[PDB]
Amino acid sequence: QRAYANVNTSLADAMAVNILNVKDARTNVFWADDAIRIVSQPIPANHELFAGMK
Amino acid sequence: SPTQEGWDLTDKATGLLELNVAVNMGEPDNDFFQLRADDLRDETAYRRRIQSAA
Structure with a gap:
């Protein structure tokens, strides 16, 4: 199962989330x-x- | 036919009588159903109910 791990650390108990939308700006989208x-x-x-x- | 005994029989002559029975017809019988277009991608169920109605 560890082959699929995309993150180094599991979520803690009290941990601050950060919302990254502070403005209404229009998107620029990119993908493979x-x-x-x-x-x-x-x-x-x-x-x-x-x-x-x- | 009726019959009556005796020689005399003056103006006792019988009339003829013949009766009737009326055959009748009834309301038609139906099996009635509908399928939306996206349900016909397999006919296998549509072919069964036609049989089930017979």
């Missing part, structure tokens, strides 16, 4: 490619139950 998957899937209207329409 294949970080966003777009899943698709057909709608099967050709079936004979739908026969009343093209």
Whole structure:
């Protein structure tokens, strides 16, 4: 399991979190490619139950 | 037919009578269901209920 460890230290008891949004500024986004998957899937209207329409 | 005994039988002549029975028809029987388009991606369940209605 230790092969997956991305952090050196587990969370303590009383520990200050830091919110990094102090302003409304508009984003600039960057990622390595294949970080966003777009899943698709057909709608099967050709079936004979739908026969009343093209 | 009725019958009556005796020789005389003046103006006792019977009339004919014949009766009736009326056959009838009833309201039709149905199995009625609907499937949205995204449910036809497998017909395997749609093919069963048609059988189940028969």
